[PDB]
Amino acid sequence: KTAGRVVRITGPVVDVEFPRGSVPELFNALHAEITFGALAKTLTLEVAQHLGDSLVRCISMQPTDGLVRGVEVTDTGASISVPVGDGVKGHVFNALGDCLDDPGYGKDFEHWSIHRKPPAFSDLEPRTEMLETGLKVVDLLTPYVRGGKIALFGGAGVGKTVLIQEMINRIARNFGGTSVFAGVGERTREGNDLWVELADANVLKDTALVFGQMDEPPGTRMRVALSALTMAEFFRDEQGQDVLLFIDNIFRFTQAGSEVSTLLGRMPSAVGYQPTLADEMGELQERITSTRGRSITSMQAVYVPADDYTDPAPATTFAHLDATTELSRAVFSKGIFPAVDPLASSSTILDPAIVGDEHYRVAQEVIRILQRYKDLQDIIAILGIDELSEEDKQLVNRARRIERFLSQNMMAAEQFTGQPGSTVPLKETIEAFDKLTKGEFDHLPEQAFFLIGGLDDLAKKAESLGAKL
Amino acid sequence: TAGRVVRITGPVVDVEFPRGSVPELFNALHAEITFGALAKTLTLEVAQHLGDSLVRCISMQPTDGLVRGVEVTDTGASISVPVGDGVKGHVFNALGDCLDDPGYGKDFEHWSIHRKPPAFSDLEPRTEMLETGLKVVDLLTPYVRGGKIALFGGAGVGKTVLIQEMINRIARNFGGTSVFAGVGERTREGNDLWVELADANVLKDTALVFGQMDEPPGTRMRVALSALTMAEFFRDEQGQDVLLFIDNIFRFTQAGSEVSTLLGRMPSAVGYQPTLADEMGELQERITSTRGRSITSMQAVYVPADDYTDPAPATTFAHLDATTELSRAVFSKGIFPAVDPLASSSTILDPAIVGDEHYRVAQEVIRILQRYKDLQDIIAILGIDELSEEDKQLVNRARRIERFLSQNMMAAEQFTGQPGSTVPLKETIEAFDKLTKGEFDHLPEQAFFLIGGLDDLAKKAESLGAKL
Amino acid sequence: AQGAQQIQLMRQQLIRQLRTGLGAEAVNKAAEIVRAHVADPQAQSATVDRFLSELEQMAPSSVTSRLRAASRQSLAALVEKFDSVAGGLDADGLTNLADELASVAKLLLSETALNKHLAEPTDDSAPKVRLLERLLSDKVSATTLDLLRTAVSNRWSTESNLIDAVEHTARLALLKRAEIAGEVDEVEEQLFRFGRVLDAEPRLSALLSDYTTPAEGRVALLDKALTGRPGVNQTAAALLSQTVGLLRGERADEAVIDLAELAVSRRGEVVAHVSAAAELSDAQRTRLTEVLSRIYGRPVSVQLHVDPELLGGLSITVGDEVIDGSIASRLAAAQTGLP
Amino acid sequence: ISAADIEGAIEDYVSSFSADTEREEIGTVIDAGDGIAHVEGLPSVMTQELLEFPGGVLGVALNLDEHSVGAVILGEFEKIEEGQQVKRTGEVLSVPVGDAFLGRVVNPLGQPIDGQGDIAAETRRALELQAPSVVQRQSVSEPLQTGIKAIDAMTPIGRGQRQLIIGDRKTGKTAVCVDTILNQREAWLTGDPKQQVRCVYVAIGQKGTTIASVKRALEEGGAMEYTTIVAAPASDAAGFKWLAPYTGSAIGQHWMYNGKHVLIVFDDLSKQADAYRAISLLLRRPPGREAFPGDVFYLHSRLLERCAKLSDELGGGSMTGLPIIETKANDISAFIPTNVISITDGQCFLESDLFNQGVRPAINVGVSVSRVGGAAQIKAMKEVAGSLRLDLSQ
Amino acid sequence: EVAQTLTQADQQLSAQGDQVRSGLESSVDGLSAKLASRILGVDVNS
Numbered sequence A: 001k002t003a004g005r006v007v008r009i010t011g012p013v014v015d016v017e018f019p020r021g022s023v024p025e026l027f028n029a030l031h032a033e034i035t036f037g038a039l040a041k042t043l044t045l046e047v048a049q050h051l052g053d054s055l056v057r058c059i060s061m062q063p064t065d066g067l068v069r070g071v072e073v074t075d076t077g078a079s080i081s082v083p084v085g086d087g088v089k090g091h092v093f094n095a096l097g098d099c100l101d102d103p104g105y106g107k108d109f110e111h112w113s114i115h116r117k118p119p120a121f122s123d124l125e126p127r128t129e130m131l132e133t134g135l136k137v138v139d140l141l142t143p144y145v146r147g148g149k150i151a152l153f154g155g156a157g158v159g160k161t162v163l164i165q166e167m168i169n170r171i172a173r174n175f176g177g178t179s180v181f182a183g184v185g186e187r188t189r190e191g192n193d194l195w196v197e198l199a200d201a202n203v204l205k206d207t208a209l210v211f212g213q214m215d216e217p218p219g220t221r222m223r224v225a226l227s228a229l230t231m232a233e234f235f236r237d238e239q240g241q242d243v244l245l246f247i248d249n250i251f252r253f254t255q256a257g258s259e260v261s262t263l264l265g266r267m268p269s270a271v272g273y274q275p276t277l278a279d280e281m282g283e284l285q286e287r288i289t290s291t292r293g294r295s296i297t298s299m300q301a302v303y304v305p306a307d308d309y310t311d312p313a314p315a316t317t318f319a320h321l322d323a324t325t326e327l328s329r330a331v332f333s334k335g336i337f338p339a340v341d342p343l344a345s346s347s348t349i350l351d352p353a354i355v356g357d358e359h360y361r362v363a364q365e366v367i368r369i370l371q372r373y374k375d376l377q378d379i380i381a382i383l384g385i386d387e388l389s390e391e392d393k394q395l396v397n398r399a400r401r402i403e404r405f406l407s408q409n410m411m412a413a414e415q416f417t418g419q420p421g422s423t424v425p426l427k428e429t430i431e432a433f434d435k436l437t438k439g440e441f442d443h444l445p446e447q448a449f450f451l452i453g454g455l456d457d458l459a460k461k462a463e464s465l466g467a468k469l
Numbered sequence B: 001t002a003g004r005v006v007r008i009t010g011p012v013v014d015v016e017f018p019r020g021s022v023p024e025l026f027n028a029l030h031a032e033i034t035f036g037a038l039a040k041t042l043t044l045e046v047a048q049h050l051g052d053s054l055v056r057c058i059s060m061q062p063t064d065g066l067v068r069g070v071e072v073t074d075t076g077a078s079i080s081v082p083v084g085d086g087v088k089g090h091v092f093n094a095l096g097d098c099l100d101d102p103g104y105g106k107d108f109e110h111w112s113i114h115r116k117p118p119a120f121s122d123l124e125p126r127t128e129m130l131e132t133g134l135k136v137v138d139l140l141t142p143y144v145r146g147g148k149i150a151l152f153g154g155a156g157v158g159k160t161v162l163i164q165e166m167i168n169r170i171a172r173n174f175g176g177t178s179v180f181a182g183v184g185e186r187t188r189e190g191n192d193l194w195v196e197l198a199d200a201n202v203l204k205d206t207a208l209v210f211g212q213m214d215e216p217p218g219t220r221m222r223v224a225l226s227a228l229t230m231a232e233f234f235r236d237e238q239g240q241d242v243l244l245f246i247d248n249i250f251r252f253t254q255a256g257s258e259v260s261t262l263l264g265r266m267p268s269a270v271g272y273q274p275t276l277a278d279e280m281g282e283l284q285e286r287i288t289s290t291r292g293r294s295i296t297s298m299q300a301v302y303v304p305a306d307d308y309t310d311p312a313p314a315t316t317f318a319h320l321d322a323t324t325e326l327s328r329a330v331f332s333k334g335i336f337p338a339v340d341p342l343a344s345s346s347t348i349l350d351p352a353i354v355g356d357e358h359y360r361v362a363q364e365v366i367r368i369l370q371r372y373k374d375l376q377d378i379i380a381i382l383g384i385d386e387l388s389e390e391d392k393q394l395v396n397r398a399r400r401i402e403r404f405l406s407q408n409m410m411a412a413e414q415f416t417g418q419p420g421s422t423v424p425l426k427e428t429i430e431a432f433d434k435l436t437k438g439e440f441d442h443l444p445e446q447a448f449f450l451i452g453g454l455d456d457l458a459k460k461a462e463s464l465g466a467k468l
Numbered sequence C: 001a002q003g004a005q006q007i008q009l010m011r012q013q014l015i016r017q018l019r020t021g022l023g024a025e026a027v028n029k030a031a032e033i034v035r036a037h038v039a040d041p042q043a044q045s046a047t048v049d050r051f052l053s054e055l056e057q058m059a060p061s062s063v064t065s066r067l068r069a070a071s072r073q074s075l076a077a078l079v080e081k082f083d084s085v086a087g088g089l090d091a092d093g094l095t096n097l098a099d100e101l102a103s104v105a106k107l108l109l110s111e112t113a114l115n116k117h118l119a120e121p122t123d124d125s126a127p128k129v130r131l132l133e134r135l136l137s138d139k140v141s142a143t144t145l146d147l148l149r150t151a152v153s154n155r156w157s158t159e160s161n162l163i164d165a166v167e168h169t170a171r172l173a174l175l176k177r178a179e180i181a182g183e184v185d186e187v188e189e190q191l192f193r194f195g196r197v198l199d200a201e202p203r204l205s206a207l208l209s210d211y212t213t214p215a216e217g218r219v220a221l222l223d224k225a226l227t228g229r230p231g232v233n234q235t236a237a238a239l240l241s242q243t244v245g246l247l248r249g250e251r252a253d254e255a256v257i258d259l260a261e262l263a264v265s266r267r268g269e270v271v272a273h274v275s276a277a278a279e280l281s282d283a284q285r286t287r288l289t290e291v292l293s294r295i296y297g298r299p300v301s302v303q304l305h306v307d308p309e310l311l312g313g314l315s316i317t318v319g320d321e322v323i324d325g326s327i328a329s330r331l332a333a334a335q336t337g338l339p
Numbered sequence D: 001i002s003a004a005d006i007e008g009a010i011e012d013y014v015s016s017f018s019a020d021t022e023r024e025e026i027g028t029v030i031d032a033g034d035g036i037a038h039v040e041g042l043p044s045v046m047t048q049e050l051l052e053f054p055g056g057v058l059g060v061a062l063n064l065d066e067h068s069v070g071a072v073i074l075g076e077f078e079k080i081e082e083g084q085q086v087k088r089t090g091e092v093l094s095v096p097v098g099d100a101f102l103g104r105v106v107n108p109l110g111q112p113i114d115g116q117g118d119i120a121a122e123t124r125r126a127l128e129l130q131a132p133s134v135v136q137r138q139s140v141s142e143p144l145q146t147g148i149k150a151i152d153a154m155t156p157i158g159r160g161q162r163q164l165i166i167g168d169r170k171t172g173k174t175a176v177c178v179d180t181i182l183n184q185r186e187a188w189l190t191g192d193p194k195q196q197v198r199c200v201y202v203a204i205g206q207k208g209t210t211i212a213s214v215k216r217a218l219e220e221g222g223a224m225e226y227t228t229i230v231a232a233p234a235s236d237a238a239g240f241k242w243l244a245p246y247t248g249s250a251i252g253q254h255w256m257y258n259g260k261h262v263l264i265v266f267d268d269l270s271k272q273a274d275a276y277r278a279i280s281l282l283l284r285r286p287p288g289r290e291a292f293p294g295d296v297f298y299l300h301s302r303l304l305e306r307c308a309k310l311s312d313e314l315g316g317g318s319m320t321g322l323p324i325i326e327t328k329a330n331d332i333s334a335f336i337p338t339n340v341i342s343i344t345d346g347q348c349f350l351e352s353d354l355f356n357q358g359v360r361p362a363i364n365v366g367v368s369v370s371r372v373g374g375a376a377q378i379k380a381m382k383e384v385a386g387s388l389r390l391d392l393s394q
Numbered sequence E: 001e002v003a004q005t006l007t008q009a010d011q012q013l014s015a016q017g018d019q020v021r022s023g024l025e026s027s028v029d030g031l032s033a034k035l036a037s038r039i040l041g042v043d044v045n046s
């Protein structure tokens, strides 16, 4: 016939020999069969390289345990495809398009290949419409962009997932469009929690969930993002419906790529990463984008290994974003939630042209005060605050109050603390931080500013402490 | 008898020759690039005998457009450059081609650029101070006539400006011959030096050899050897005093490391070739004065990423008689020349050669600067008021001393508009003795910034309201 | 001014869209008319004749390869020695020589150490000749011993080159006996046909292209499947059988193609593969042979691979150079050549 | 809108259509993947020759050995398969060049990507023509005003100079370069080519919408009339990212050698270095520090040495370079930043700390320098800003 | 006013382009026939 046979197996990577003239194209899906009892299954191999001599190196989506050399391998003749349409909403899928909450569902749907080129450059248009979230720190210092790309960077356990949940609550809840969530190499129980929460909040009927989680082979963990992005692309390009795309975690896509590259025999780059790290990341990211008249607001949680922000993965990820919230271990240690580093975070739309002159002025004054406090940390760690000048002492008190007031009781934090969250209008945020920067609340105790919403909450908490606003 | 190209990989070309016609190591071979846009004649240098009648060679020119299987011709000798008095006043490339007058010097005597260093029995240590008129150099890093001088520093700290200043101060009145070797530096800088030497009328005594950073690794590896071959001819044959300026000698090592792995060599630490020290010694041991034949060599040494512990500068250190080490910290303070007084050194800075007064004043300056360096962080954190009276006095003296070590350099006018100054050694010693004794503590430290001798100090102090 | 520039750009863009649409429709209609006009076989013949004329209007080309210079020279010496030796040999003698040489080649392949020792280049070959004589002076005939001593006396870059040279000499003997018989064209045609059928059945070649199994078994498989047929030429059969028997990690189809190339090269010609949409006429074949020989100087044999997708003209590949006169190439160029 | 023009053009093309046959040297793909291919054959291919793959795909021959040719696919490598036929083009890698490239956005091969039709190329220029020699240049003497006081006074940039803009992400590097491009609007409006500056903005590994934002900013300020963008977005293959600066340099060099003054911005060379490292690793060349190839310094040295100030004998044209480098955690000691700092004629070093303090542009005065100095300033600026940088350092 | 002029011109040019396209529909046959003549190397009447 024309089927190949397995010749080499090195974990997830498989070498397959085909008859001449039947070598499958790159990224084609191939099917092999594992027949051993407990592990019996059908393997989907994605062609990754042509090795010559009619050999192809392929990445397996399922574990290859139990696979035998010489077993027949059949070429599907196309790449991995996933179901698309309004039918995907409300259902949970895996990287290959199989429905998990209801097996067999979506087999009759239109199927789109998970590999496609990004939009033509001529169709790209910069997006600068502010997306108001109701979080003080985000709205003030890192205003999110509607139809733009937002990222949440952070080491282990600084609050990336909780912030993703917060943004799902604040944005996807009262959203007229569709939402796509892509769990990429994260906790499976987190996927179950998200499923149940979306069902409870009635947002699930408008959301499509695709999960390739930690206990998956690197091939699945590097293709699940493509699958979810394909569903989002269908919603963007075929139904003209505003799309929300939450991804957690994209660094796991990079990590799976690194593992595959190691298995594929590629010569490692710096820090052991794949040589094609930036290229793979760009190929993925340029697909996540709004086009003229077609909006995708994407929000990606990016894991920072060992709290190292100079690691190649996040370092290359930084360039693909319109807004970048950076969660810091130190801020988290102080108890400030969300543990945003206001000096390392940024937004392309935080300029006087877009957000107005007063918003920009207040943000810049807050940043200046916090930068001066950061500079003075060296003195303060040794001698405390009392060796500073009167100007610097006043600035330090103001800065401590400001950094506490950037924290907020989040909606998604209720499950942890039992305290309901708060929403602060942008105008109130600007007014409040203008008052802070001018020293109108210097008399209030610091804890009065901790985990509250607007100025009314500030007054109530200050009164409960003992100071009157 | 001709060979043929077998493998091309960047600047490294493998060539197969008929058995019995394999060229000797370091022989120059010729290949043709016939493509119209890049038509040229490549000079390859045999680097290795791979066996089976194959040789690995380093191209002196870009290999773009080279084809497999093209004829390769063996010249039978190494790269050779013209020597004689005709080189003076002209610009050459690494291969001996005249740039400002193509075809010039083809009839001169040609010397191979590969040569053993002088016999050890002909080596005589040089202990004779070469005055420059720069306060910091003359006081703390006195240069040696016929000795080896280096200017160490990171990128953009003043090495090239200092080399130009020393060309102005030393070579202009020099009675002998000067050789400048641009090694992997900016072509614009080479043009500026050419024009400046022409303007000063120093060019007629100077031979310029350029291989710039846009050239392939082979040219940057062999340009220093070419210039040194010309200088060696002037030393051994013509029997005249030679000035040799090299900028930048680190580029020789860097070019060596660029092709090291393509030659099949396992990397050493910090990504350098295993034969770092050997190649550096082969090149440097030729840069020397012999008994009765003088070469005063001055080399700019780039320190990668300001790291003085990097293998290349660390290896280079041992080959020098005097070293002026420029610092990024001094540079960023605004002191110029950005010399690091505590790190620079000179083998003739001892009482026997420079005399008791000079040595004592230099040592006292070094002690004051070391103490100030120790107290700097204390001052930064706890403030200066918490020092003792002696420490406060020392800090004032040290700040004035560090400012006074700066000087308005002749070659720095384009960067400041201020004409340069020259301070005689006696005046430098006297002024720094006075500074260490505290006789100028009544003047603002700003009075000591970028001035010449004591008269300039008095004038600037007057302009600032102080009196000297 | 910005508004005026935008208006002008819009005008230019509209002109561009109209031009692109017009050109696309025109070129599609051109493709349709071309595919309709090429249907007539007379049209095919006319296109072929025009391409032939283009060839006669073309200037001549300026112009075992895997062997190194040393091994190539050694093999040249070996082949000229064989040519001198074979003058007196007869058909049965040549067959015995080929069988003995193939046996010696398989002996060397099986016995790696002896071939290794026998392959190291040395200034004096007397020890090697003594080793051969002590080994197989009586086992093989005088001519085989002379050829083997010549082969060892020369220089081989790598040990496998010696086995390659011995196999080359065996094939040389088989082709020489074929030439003496007078079936040179028949054996060439049969070898090319075997190459074609192996190419059609890649799996058969892959099964035959493994030396992990005994040689006799695969030779028997070849005999049963392809070689053992009523019309197969005896010399081609023996040549292919020995080649498959001596296979060392090469595909049977590639080996057969190499065998055909060697068989044609013995006459001094070069094989050129010509793809056409329709079978050429005998006058067309003669004209093509003449013009290709003129272009490449030495005469060339022509192999035809009819393929309707060419839509006339010819695609001639030879010596790693392709002249693509196929009308399909012209249509593709016109499609992609639009402004 | 004249239809007769449309017909005329189509008829002219069809008449000009001559798909005449010719002899071509071929090869065969033996293995491909990750944007690299290996080709058997091509006995006469020359180093860094453009190769044609089926389907309109282009590659470049980098490794030439006795067996095969290791080639880098310049875009759309997913269609490359074993056994495909590869053609020679008989010419080293080169791009079209001409005045028509002004106002356009092209990829590293010069093909338009703004969807505005073909570009009329005056001629073609090879990408590896060597830089002017020591004798072919003249000293930098003409200012290139950026409109930014902190730069024009303290680190002046002259025509024919390479000034490095180096700093952490979001420190204002692109802002400085785009402001410099926009500042040449008056010089362009003069109409005097001795004063006009033609700008080339090379975007390497940048997000597509970011390049669109840059183009929009240039449009609004009128700069797009005298500016060309060579775009190699993040989605592109490593070949384009590696090749884009050389394409922009060739386009600028065509104007420079014809008496025009050019300003080229490389945004940024860090991503070009990463793309070159990826290509070299995929070709399995021996890596060096941080996995970069041994000749990564040469990659940028030969690129930035083409930015020169030609002598009067060559027309007096110039090309000013503004390479951009991104540092991580303010580490100018990293390999690529140190490489580039040692190439350019000074640097403007931008700080997040200074930026947050309100010092914008965030020039670190102590560390930033211009190696041309007063020669790149007018007499009045020299007189007033004689020692400003030194005073600020003190 | 720039936007108003732009939309007016867009409509006017769209109408002009549509009607010129309709007018030139005819010549496509001759264009294709003559291009095919060029491709085949011999004039094709069709």
Ligand SMILES: Nc1ncnc2c1ncn2[C@@H]1O[C@H](COP(=O)(O)OP(=O)(O)OP(=O)(O)O)[C@@H](O)[C@H]1O
Pocket (backbone or CB within 6 Å): A154, A155, A156, A157, A158, A159, A160, A161, A162, A163, A303, A337, A338, A410, A412, A413, A416, A417
């Ligand atoms: N807003 C918040 N209020 C209170 N506690 C919080 C908040 N955000 C995070 N936490 C605490 O931090 C823990 C980690 O949060 P989260 O899972 O969102 O972090 P992460 O950055 O996604 O972590 P990981 O690297 O493990 O995926 C939460 O379980 C909770 O204990």
Ligand SMILES: Nc1ncnc2c1ncn2[C@@H]1O[C@H](COP(=O)(O)OP(=O)(O)OP(=O)(O)O)[C@@H](O)[C@H]1O
Pocket (backbone or CB within 6 Å): A347, A348, A350, A351, D168, D169, D170, D171, D172, D173, D174, D175, D176, D360, D361
């Ligand atoms: N002089 C300035 N004054 C105020 N804001 C500025 C100034 N220059 C730049 N900015 C703002 O700083 C932010 C970063 O600017 P820019 O995009 O030029 O930086 P960059 O270093 O190129 O960034 P990236 O890492 O995204 O490439 C943008 O919001 C820009 O508007």
Ligand SMILES: Nc1ncnc2c1ncn2[C@@H]1O[C@H](COP(=O)(O)OP(=O)(O)O)[C@@H](O)[C@H]1O
Pocket (backbone or CB within 6 Å): B153, B154, B155, B156, B157, B158, B159, B160, B161, B162, B336, B337, B409, B412, B415, B416, D369, D370, D371, D372, D373
């Ligand atoms: N004596 C000086 N006075 C003022 N500026 C100087 C002086 N020396 C160097 N500089 C500044 O530092 C820059 C770097 O000097 P240069 O020697 O060219 O670099 P490098 O040290 O890398 O060779 C100069 O371009 C100049 O602007």
Ligand SMILES: [Mg+2]
Pocket (backbone or CB within 6 Å): A160, A161, A162, A186
């Ligand atoms: Mg998480």
Ligand SMILES: [Mg+2]
Pocket (backbone or CB within 6 Å): B159, B160, B161, B185
């Ligand atoms: Mg220098």
Ligand SMILES: [Mg+2]
Pocket (backbone or CB within 6 Å): D173, D174, D175, D267
């Ligand atoms: Mg930027």
